[PDB]
Design a protein around this nucleic acid. Sequence first.
DNA 1: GACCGGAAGGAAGGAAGTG
DNA 2: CACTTCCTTCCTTCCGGTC
Lengths: 94, 100, 106
Amino acid sequence: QIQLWQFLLELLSDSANASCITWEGTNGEFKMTDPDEVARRWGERKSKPNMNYDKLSRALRYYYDKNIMTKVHGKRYAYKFDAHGIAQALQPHP
Amino acid sequence: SRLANGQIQLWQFLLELLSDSANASCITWEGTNGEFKMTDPDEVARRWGERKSKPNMNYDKLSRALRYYYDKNIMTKVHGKRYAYKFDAHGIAQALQPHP
Amino acid sequence: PYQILGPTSSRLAIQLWQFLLELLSDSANASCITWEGTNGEFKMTDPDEVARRWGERKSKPNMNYDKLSRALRYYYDKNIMTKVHGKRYAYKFDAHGIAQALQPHP
DNA sequence: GACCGGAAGGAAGGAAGTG
DNA sequence: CACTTCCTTCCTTCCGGTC
């Protein structure tokens, strides 16, 4: 199915959807400017009327452990994709 | 369990680590009746990955596996303690020699 | 409803979809399973009861919902039934799938 | 309110065993 | 085959907590 981490890159790529989500430079760093709006779409996308930011953020926090993306400290609605994290998952040395 | 004799099952693999106290770092017992605790859930998960050739394995995915054992009655959650699961002898007994 | 009881009772004259419609026949089993719309949509109101029974009729214990559900998950591509999106324990039969299985018309 | 992480359980679909 | 078995993967859907 459509994975969340993918569905975010679906909207980040389109600069017309800068109202809800957009990049913030650094290195693969991004922000949700309208947190509710993001969750609202990811809701309808998966036939989910209840899906809010809390339920979405939970989904994102699992990626801290999967080592896909990390939370940008202090900065509100700030999540940064982890290159090394993703690189250590497709070039592993057990 | 030594009475085992497909691949290793999680409930089995855990009893392998529990038997040896060299692995007391990440997993260990907590009183009688098979109450056990994971003292480093991260470590346990990583080995269950090593054993099943699956480097991605993390608690969320491992833990989900344990939670399927509630209907098999193979092991149970200790509600009080964090990262603490209790085995069920009768469960693994019925799992090995089922009687209709 | 009555229309769907055509296929079910004609095959009754043992696969899992057959057994599910054997449960939907009459009622008193409404406690565990029943219909939504008579299009095909149906819900399991006690999933773990449906399971317990299905295991009993096949003479195999340790038959939970996950093991039953996985069986329904293979019916997706055979086109015997489909999932109802965002409805806990809700599935929908495909008449055109049951058609091919009862009568082969290539 | 944003943020953290258990914990439960759904739902999908691989992979190997059943008989 | 038509499942059964055992997951792995990916989340919703609650929480009781920190800040």
